[PDB]
Amino acid sequence: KTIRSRSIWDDAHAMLEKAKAEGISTVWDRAAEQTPACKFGELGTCCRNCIMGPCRIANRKDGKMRLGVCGADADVIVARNFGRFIAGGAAGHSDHGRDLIETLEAVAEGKAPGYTIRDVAKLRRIAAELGVADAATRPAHDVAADLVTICYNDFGSRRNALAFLARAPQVRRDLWQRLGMTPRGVDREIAEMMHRTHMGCDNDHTSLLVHAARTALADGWGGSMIGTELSDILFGTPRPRQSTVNLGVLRKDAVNILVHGHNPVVSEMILAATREPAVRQAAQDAGAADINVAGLCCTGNELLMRQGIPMAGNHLMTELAIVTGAADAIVADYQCIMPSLVQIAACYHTRFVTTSPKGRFTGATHVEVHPHNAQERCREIVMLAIDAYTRRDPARVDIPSQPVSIMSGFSNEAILEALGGTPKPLIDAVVAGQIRGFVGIVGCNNPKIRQDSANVTLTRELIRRDIMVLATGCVTTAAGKAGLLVPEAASKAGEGLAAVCRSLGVPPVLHMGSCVDNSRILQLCALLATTLGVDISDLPVGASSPEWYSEKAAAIAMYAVASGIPTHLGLPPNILGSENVTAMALHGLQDVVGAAFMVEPDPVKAADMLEAHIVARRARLGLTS
Amino acid sequence: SKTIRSRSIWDDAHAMLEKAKAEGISTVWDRAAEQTPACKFGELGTCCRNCIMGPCRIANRKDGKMRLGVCGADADVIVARNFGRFIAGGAAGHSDHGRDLIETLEAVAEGKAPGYTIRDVAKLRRIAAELGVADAATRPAHDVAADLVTICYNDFGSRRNALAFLARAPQVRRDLWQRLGMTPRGVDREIAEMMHRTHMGCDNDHTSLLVHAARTALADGWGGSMIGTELSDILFGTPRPRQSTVNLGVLRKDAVNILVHGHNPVVSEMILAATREPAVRQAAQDAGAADINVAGLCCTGNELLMRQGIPMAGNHLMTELAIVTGAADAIVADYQCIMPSLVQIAACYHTRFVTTSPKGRFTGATHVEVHPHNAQERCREIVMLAIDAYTRRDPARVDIPSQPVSIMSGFSNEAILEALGGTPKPLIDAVVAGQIRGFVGIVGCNNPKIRQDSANVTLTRELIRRDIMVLATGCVTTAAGKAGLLVPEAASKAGEGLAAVCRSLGVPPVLHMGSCVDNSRILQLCALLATTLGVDISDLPVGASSPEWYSEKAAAIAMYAVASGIPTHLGLPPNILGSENVTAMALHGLQDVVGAAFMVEPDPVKAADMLEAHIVARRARLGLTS
């Protein structure tokens, strides 16, 4: 009964039973040990920013402990904690985008063996969009070098606004300018946030949250957008394609390589290495029928979008994938890689390989990958996987399920091509009421919530109401395993959405990529708002993260709100200890940026709130629901 | 009151604590008492709040539970990530300050800063030539300033391999940083990568986390802080030796008392210029005041002291007590280390609390935001508010406690070398001969957990007694000053060797070298001595000490001193003791890789023994007498 309460999936149930019998502790077991959690940490009323503290703000009968040693009240302490929370998340996406710039610079210099510019057409378009002279005709490497220079300048301190901010409608850029939210530099907003949250600097919760919006905007319109667009340039723009999801993508007769993390610069070369004939011969000589690459988390989302590589699972499936006994190697870069995977791998034959200087795990096998040596290093990593496969215990192998078919690869380019090259067919459907609105579901998993129970229920509730769902991150696996990522899932949608979906041959849920690919949603909203001559806060759109946990999810939520997109959260951030901060997040922000946060653990109630905002925006546009 | 005596060693502090008690005004010590005892996990660093799978606590339990976070992170990772963000917050404090100096200098170069000039064009040309500006000696000053601005901005970019001022460090030190992966590449970049590394499921190795923490702090001392110091001297003048006064007695009953608080001189320099305008002086006269009296608090007070000789009212734990005097007519604040309780205590009086920076917002304060293009008009408006507040001053609540103590300030490296005849050779000769056995930079704040300035003053006395010259920055300036140690006559309190050298040069045994960002002056001086002697900084008989620190910035200064080869003592430990591995590396392991380590010791006399021990050992390795 305990195992049933932790997930809605059979492959998760099977592996939780297996781990229990083998005495392997999982994320759910550790979540139980940390319950009940500290009230002050959950409320955000704890400050550790100097050693005059640590300080706790409590509501006491005797009136003590209302202020920190420095005099800060709960509003400042909660706001500064939330500001650093957002900054850590924005920094996660920022360094990711910085790595794509360096990779593209290596290709332009001819110092990346095995890497190329897969999409020169998009390279010329993005470079011309940002002001590169003669981007349409000059040599591709020269054009790439100028785009590299432009992107690096957004990681400098001399701009007035980020380069991609020009995509946002003019009314939105003027608003950001009036509010002091205009993001100037990707790294700069992160550094200034850490300065503001230092003792005795910014001590106004309104100022701190305004800069928190500015910091997250430097992510969505900077770090993440650069990461998405350069990844398509380097590795190809996604197109619609079919694949499979869940633990059944692992094969007993093959060498199973699971890529984990966020950077496609590594996993793309891992895949190229497994396709070399000499490498395949080595696997055959070892008794394997083939080498099978399968994806985890966002880098799995990336390989899914561009190569159709099947995904093994999402956040809370990562440990369970090793428990299958068929994981021969885990190739990790950085972010959201639970260090418990090292210990669980030690229980089996699995090799846990780290590849990034930023993602170091004690006890892991480190094979550091850079653009100049990726081809040889990734070949070496695959050979380690083939070797570990030879030591695999066949009696402990249990692959639980059969893979479920999914459809992926819905970039904005792919969406517009399916519409004939213009957004007019999409705008027509919204005006007609067939598609009443769009909601991006971009959440994770969280041990406090039965895995994917809220992701799937909300996705079902929204498509029932003719609201198209845009899926990224961990929701990709949830919607996939529920059979909603195929064109045949139109039968589960309402009459309006099903008709549009069947007309285009697309699912009612569109996989648009990884967590950084939420910038694709920003681009799509900006494109629609610009076309109609309105603000993004006028579009019938919404965002939802029903089962989030990370700093990156909070930064995504913040820049969606700051861009005019109403954003729902299944769980609250650590801010409830301040009524002023909570009121601003839930209500005050609506007055300034035209959107706000929503906290609601009931997915059906979450759908009512998302649909309510959509209906209100449809009315202001003069449409019927 | 036995309690009031236990909180500070100074009479003006005792007098104001008695006054605040009689008037029912709670101070920083009173809130410190309420927060005692503090949470064990917060003090140990074994608490993580970096995601809402937590918050997580690491406990030592009989049943073995709560050994790992929900993500699987152990105490070593959790403590190192918390300490890494602690350092990042401190480096960000100095980073944004240096960035503001770059923008101010760019405004002057563009001719868009009315009232600002390049006060030290000679230093501008020297710094620009040092960093590679072409024809810095002959081209127009504004063109030279513009090219230096571009170089400094590039250090706040993401395309450099090493910071521009890193060339000052000895080659052996630069090679070591390169081998360790510590070379700071971009000021903002290291801060952003640290926040990325400490995100869940990124960097989960406490050794890697601390190595990048060193890299982040090096981006401060050799980047954010060093840019701030050198451009400040270019904009506002290079400090030279001068006389002034310290303590609450610098406030005048017959004058409009304006206290500048914070860290950025871009504001306080123009406040001072505003008070010298005849129309502004006429307004003070029309209000009945004999003059306009500007006095300093914290680092911006250190800045005005070094360059203008403006008297200092007090250090960190004196800031509230200065308002309790009843004579503080205005507080002009920029950012950092400004306790928000000053707003409430000001409301108890006539005092105007004025904020000036978009980054330094205080709820309930009067905000008059200052930028280079409007500073001259805005600062004029701020002084008028002080004169207006002065008219509403209640004379019955006025109590200025003490008589000011004389001090000598303005010892920049340029001033130190000028007193030596233009070369460091007399200083090196004194060190080799054993008259000056070593140097210790005493930096740091106050901390309510320690009787105010009891450790700062005792250590300063213990060190100069042992012929160890003290270089004072930050809050120690006020401590040494009020103890009468910042004057040439204080050579009598030193040993025979230091007293002879001090009397020979006419300098005190304690040299005030400026604010917290001016600790970069100590890096420059150490680097100059190491290069001249052809050794590493880890070979010099030097030390750093922060007996009464509290802030993230103090931790970042200590870290980049250690990472640069300077043994650094702390009176109190950071929140790291919950990890034996992290504690061992900070106290011992770093000695193996960077040639220096942290020291935690609350007894100031024992702190002097440890600093002297490292100094003696380095003298032996140099082939000198101890």
Ligand code: SF4
């Ligand atoms: S959140 Fe604060 S009070 Fe709670 S355990 Fe962590 S440090 Fe202690």
Ligand code: SF4
């Ligand atoms: S910054 Fe203020 S509230 Fe936070 S720990 Fe320090 S004294 Fe306490």
Ligand code: SF4
């Ligand atoms: S990062 Fe790990 S240890 Fe920290 S709060 Fe999240 S789950 Fe707990």
